[PDB]
Design a protein around this ligand. Structure first.
Ligand SMILES: Oc1cccc(-c2ccccc2)c1O
Ligand SMILES: Oc1cccc(-c2ccccc2)c1O
Ligand SMILES: Oc1cccc(-c2ccccc2)c1O
Ligand SMILES: Oc1cccc(-c2ccccc2)c1O
Ligand SMILES: Oc1cccc(-c2ccccc2)c1O
Ligand SMILES: Oc1cccc(-c2ccccc2)c1O
Ligand SMILES: [Fe+3]
Ligand SMILES: [Fe+3]
Ligand SMILES: [Fe+3]
Ligand SMILES: [Fe+3]
Ligand SMILES: [Fe+3]
Ligand SMILES: [Fe+3]
Lengths: 289, 289, 289, 289, 289, 289
């Protein structure tokens, strides 16, 4: 029922660092501010990522998009049936988020989630990257994806699939140690191999990282050099086993939260069949320190 | 349930001006007459636009097309269920309109609407433009679209979507003044981004304008020069924010009713998601006097 | 429910003339005999057209194909519900027709119809035309189409659509005289614009003609010269208004029954909308004597 | 050396008939007049065919186009070397013809020929057919072709190939009688299978016919019906053996001079090899009276 | 309901011969062992074919794949409703098979069948053929197909279609003798023309052969020479009548069980219609001794 | 300078056997006779292969085609310069061969060669195969190729390359025995990998075989079964190392002269580089007895 991931809001300790990070390194376009939140664009939407000050230094919320007013009421019906508490956003929030309607709730482990519809677009202000990137792959596949750290994956799974309508793509047993592995569950709600992944990681953050997809392989190559120069590279280039995304990882100015910049993944559809992988990379992704 | 907009009938004060306008400027083909109505063709249909004399100087009616006899009965069922009054057109009207069956009704604010099926085609009389235009984009997308002025957009919306089956594409807040904006609602019933748009404009006409789509960008460029020479240009070339149509506007011989001549729009489908725009043009469309 | 027209059986007064006609003129391949019926092939099927001796000099029967055993039982259910009498073909008939199962019935006006499934194919005996024709367009669209003469078109319509599942494509008012026209109804049951057309013609035959589609335009051009040399041309090349088929007509050795040899038609689908035409040809088809 | 056939000038006894013929039947666009010559357009050139009054009722001249000023001087050099008399057109003629430079000469048998360059184009006045024809195939292949009647084909051949640079495509032995055949020689100077054909026909005209190529097969089909209605059809549709053009012939208002309206021919190139044919048609072209 | 054939397990008397056969001749990649079973890969799956020691010298089991956990429960529901006995595989079996969940059952005639989901993939260990083969066609179509010998085809048919969800593609009457033929029934559960065929053959094996599809025609040509050198060819190259697969047959080291190596078949879909053939080959496949 | 191989003339002891062979087995079309020679067609040419009675049971002559009259004179110039004797064919021979001009000569070892131009085509008599073959690949690549047995390959090479203009493609050392190999030289004069191959074979014929190329792989497969039924197969299907042609060989009714029926070869061009192969087949072609 949730169609795609449309926006992300972060509450960070270093807004200037995050502003420089998202623009000069990642290539996003600065798009003014809404309240105490600095806004950034990746395409035609008024904003895709918001950054406001806060001790959290973590994702503050995520906007899940539906296609119309009716779909939103249908989600209210689901949440209601599932016993999930939610509050319809008021005019002020709608104004702040620049959406036509929204429902505010939280996932089973405290992550604020906003289900909306009717997002604002500004085609009269053509997207202009702040760094050399031909463009970002969004559209029907949403802004990208993020890995949600959860203390109980089964509990998380039931919510995201049974309540939100996400669908399991596959599972990767991410090796933590010699005899330790974390079964990461990748979920989709559209063509993007996965929009949200759930994993019981021993990390104190709401998310492990968020991912952005560029149009070309060179976009990623160039972006790697930029973040390397910034001294934030955490992994070498590589290609995943499940989505076949070619990317690299880097630290965001927020401790223990990374960003993934990738290209050319594999998209899902009706015929998708669940599989299991023992590695996150078919090649590359060597961890960097 | 309504499949597309098939024809338009205008009641004007200056038939000769309208005849010259539709043929020499727009490029339509003169196709004889039906009663006191002069007929004009854009493709293989016997007629697409009818022009008869009248003080109205406004759209007299619009023909909404369904695919077969069964679909028409199904519409009668809807109108009946919704409590919408209608009269089945008699043999004479069917003859006049050149259709196999039709239902005559009015929208909530007085615009006569005719739901029909079985339109007449004359492939043995190949369309020949009266001006240089490679052709018009019609087919499954109908003759084009028109903006319906309404005093109550919510009231209009309920009728066109709930009763006629149109679907909201998006909304544009058209700036009227410094602190004044009119939320124009664009609706589709097929692949054309929008076939009918509803807007509470302070205009004394049933419609703000009707639009025709040409096959090439040059068709539009040439058409602009023709209407400029006629001294009827009301807007420079531009591209819309929502449908991405590249067009220009011009006055029809009927005061306060314009025509839009465009090309290369963006078509809708099942995956279409509702969005909101603050401008009607991503570029161009500068108003001309 | 009927998927396509698979075969035709004729009972004629001049088998040798019909044999020469179907092979040397039309280009079909002689495929032996079944009982007193000479068989002819157009593709991979064991036979497509059968010709046996009889005073009738008319179509003796038509085979309507479904996709499997279940579909055939479902047709028996329909016929049963509609009160249409039918007899399940015995082993001998199944052997004669080379099908896995069939139901024998008649349309409302005496035309024997056989609904079957599981037709025999002989890919080990590659089709070889008896005249220069690159090939015939059959496949999912069946062997071609035929025009069924009926005394009551409404009565015929109810049967073919309501009972057999055919769907009305469009109507052409075929001019018979000065103030006389016959509304021919074209029906499809697949992609072929029409597989069966119903028309109240003042002809003493069960059908007006049967049609075969060739792969190229030259196939038709060459075929025209062959039948001209045979002195059987009844019409010049032309293109229809509704299906856009480019063809010509010619007399079969059976008085008042013609054959149409065409190419490059227009195929139908879910989006097909019913229309009406005043001519059968957009160009050509001038009647020849 | 001659690049293509660019224009034709006719001197006829019935200008009104020729005007109606070229516009309403053929579909050309009326383009004003130059002197006592009425001009007609087929594309972006100022004019392609000129028609002036004269007892001749025959082609008055043909314009052979080269690509630039240097090429024209190079032709003067050839004509000079070959001993062919010619007169450089004056300013007035250049103005009349709307070309930048031209050489006036005659072929060995009296046909005035004008070799020019720098033709006038009027893209600001988009071509508009006077009849339903999607367009004409000209471009690098020139306006079309024509069959030049000559009393001595060898003599004609030496001139057109050795002096003008045309190249023999193939030969067709056109049957005149029981034991009589005329070897028609087809020549090209570009991609069009042939721009000029030489044949020793027992006809009192400079040419047997001129040919125009349309964009679609329907253009030809429709054009056939128009000229049939005019009662000028001289041949049924057909396809040639050598160029594979699908066309039909019709009488021009000038006795013994016809016009050919065709489509989809076969173009030549470096790899073209000379062949011989015994018929002018692979199918069709049955002579009509 | 069964989506595709994912794996095969054989119990043979000569493991070394089978190891050499599958790798050096067929081209599969050796992939270690699971228990006393040697594993072989054809693509990204951990294993596709398992070979363990046993007197059987026959297929020991076949794994039928579904797309997810829910689909597997839905199969349990079917088996339960149909009265088919089955045992949910334990953790150990799941580990041995490298799947997320499975149901163990038998077809009506003793062939062990395992319905599973969540297969293991190892993209970090790219498939490497042990012989020159560009690759194998698997994906959504599964590992290939196999012919199941049954004593009662009707009984077998009811199970595979009514219980497992396979669908009849067509039937071939395979000639056994002068007046003896076996009606082989080909079934699909996806795009592969057939994944399982049922035939009442007078052979003492559970299957007649298993088939693997290569990417190119040369893969098959080369593979033929390899198995010829091994002296195992049982049939010359040929093309089937029903699936249009171009292949050859060869003996596996297990008496009376062959292997088919083919390419370029014809795939099925919703529009597939049941047909009957009298031969298994349109050409070739001459039996070799 | 020689553009392609256009025709072949055989002098055989069994014309009826050769007639049946070329038509029912190979699929060629019977095209009447010229003198005591029976003619056969493969495409639009009047004839491609001629068969007359003679004790020779060998190729009687080969026609080498040039593109025009000038090219033929240029060949006369070469032959003259090289000291090669030749006789210009008279009117009668030209009539017999159906060409516009020809030069008769012999290669260094007695094979009569005819260099011609202006071949006759009969598009009004569409090619119709006498057996199921979709068509033959000829066109600019000529009728096919043949292997010329020579006692001195160097001597033969100098003539065909230095005098006729053929170009060496590559060489294959065809194994004759344990320590015996014959270096076969493949030559092209156009896109066909080779039109003539020279090899010092211990065979008493002028040629080892002639080759024909079909349009599809099935054409070859079907043709194999036909010649197998005729009991003339001399080799199994295979693919060559140099031209990558997939074919099979079979005996012609003339002792020690075979025919090769192939498909999908590799064509040459300016960039072709000479290479050497140790085998004639990359796979298949196993010799059959
Ligand atoms: O796109 C992706 C595909 C597969 C695995 C990961 C992943 C890697 C490390 C930690 C968490 C997830 C990922 O990001
Ligand atoms: O095609 C269109 C797309 C977006 C806006 C308009 C519009 C502009 C001015 C007044 C009313 C509508 C339009 O015509
Ligand atoms: O394919 C076709 C399309 C339209 C009309 C006819 C038709 C013409 C004359 C008599 C009956 C039918 C037809 O055959
Ligand atoms: O385009 C063409 C191709 C072949 C022949 C003719 C031709 C026919 C009759 C008289 C003169 C020429 C032609 O026009
Ligand atoms: O792929 C195939 C298609 C058609 C028949 C067979 C077959 C042949 C011999 C014995 C059993 C089946 C086959 O394998
Ligand atoms: O097309 C071909 C390509 C390579 C070799 C041969 C050949 C084989 C045996 C004897 C002579 C030539 C051939 O025909
Ligand atoms: Fe990621
Ligand atoms: Fe508009
Ligand atoms: Fe018809
Ligand atoms: Fe011509
Ligand atoms: Fe098989
Ligand atoms: Fe060869």
């Amino acid at each position: 029922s949730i169609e795609r991931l449309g926006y992300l809001g972060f509450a960070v300790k270093d807004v200037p660092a995050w502003d420089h990070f998202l623009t000069k390194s990642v290539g996003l376009m600065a798009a003014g501010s809404a309240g105490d939140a600095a806004l950034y664009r990746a395409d035609q939407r008024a904003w895709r990522i918001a950054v406001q000050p806060g001790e959290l230094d973590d994702l503050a919320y995520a906007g899940l998009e539906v296609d119309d007013a009716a779909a939103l009421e249908r989600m209210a019906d689901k949440l209601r049936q599932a016993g999930v508490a939610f509050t319809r956003g008021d005019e002020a929030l709608m104004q702040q988020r620049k959406v036509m309607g929204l429902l505010c709730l939280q996932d089973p482990f405290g992550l604020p989630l906003e289900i909306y519809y009717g997002p604002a677009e500004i085609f009269h202000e053509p997207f202009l990257p702040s760094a050399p990137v031909s463009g970002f792959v969004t559209g029907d596949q949403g802004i990208g994806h993020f890995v949600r750290c959860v203390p109980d994956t089964a509990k998380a799974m039931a919510f995201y699939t049974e309540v939100l309508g996400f669908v399991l793509s596959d599972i990767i047993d991410i090796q933590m140690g010699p005899e330790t592995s974390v079964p990461a569950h990748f979920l989709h709600c559209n063509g993007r191999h996965h929009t949200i992944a759930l994993a019981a990681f021993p990390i104190p953050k709401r998310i492990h990282h968020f991912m952005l997809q560029a149009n070309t392989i060179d976009d990623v190559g160039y972006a790697f050099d930029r973040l390397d120069a910034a001294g934030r590279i955490t992994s070498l280039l590589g290609r995943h086993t499940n989505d076949q995304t070619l990317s690299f990882y880097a630290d965001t100015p927020s401790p223990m939260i990374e960003v993934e910049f990738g290209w050319g993944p594999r998209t899902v559809d009706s015929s998708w069949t669940v599989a299991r992988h023992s590695r996150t990379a078919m090649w590359g992704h060597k961890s960097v320190r």
